Design a protein around this nucleic acid. Structure first.
Length: 102
RNA sequence: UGCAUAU
């Protein structure tokens, strides 16, 4: 009996040029039409909620296609960007070993 | 408030 975990897995997609009005539900309706959304982020600033964010798909299966369909769309008249995010950290902690053989 | 990676 081995680990037998899932394959597609959640991704953080960055979203940009979006109107100043867009929040959690306004971003997630735009991607969640293809599959399912877990969590959604909008960069938190001194002005309040910003015209820039991220979306957390349930699985890469819809995260891949969704960014492909949404990138180059002009939501609320603003040609957007969508790509895979940096998430929390760029200093990966998942695994380590003293050797590098095999 | 058009500030653009996770102030």
């Amino acid at each position: 009996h081995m680990n037998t975990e899932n394959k597609s897995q959640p991704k953080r997609l960055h979203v940009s040029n979006i109107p100043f009005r867009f929040r959690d539900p306004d971003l997630r309706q735009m991607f969640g039409q293809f599959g399912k959304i877990l969590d959604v982020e909008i960069i938190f600033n001194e002005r309040g909620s910003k015209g820039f964010g991220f979306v957390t798909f349930e699985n890469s299966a819809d995260a891949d296609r969704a960014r492909e369909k949404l990138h180059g769309t002009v939501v609320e008249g603003r040609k957007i960007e969508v790509n895979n995010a940096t998430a929390r950290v760029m200093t990966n902690k998942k695994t380590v070993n003293p050797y590098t053989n095999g």
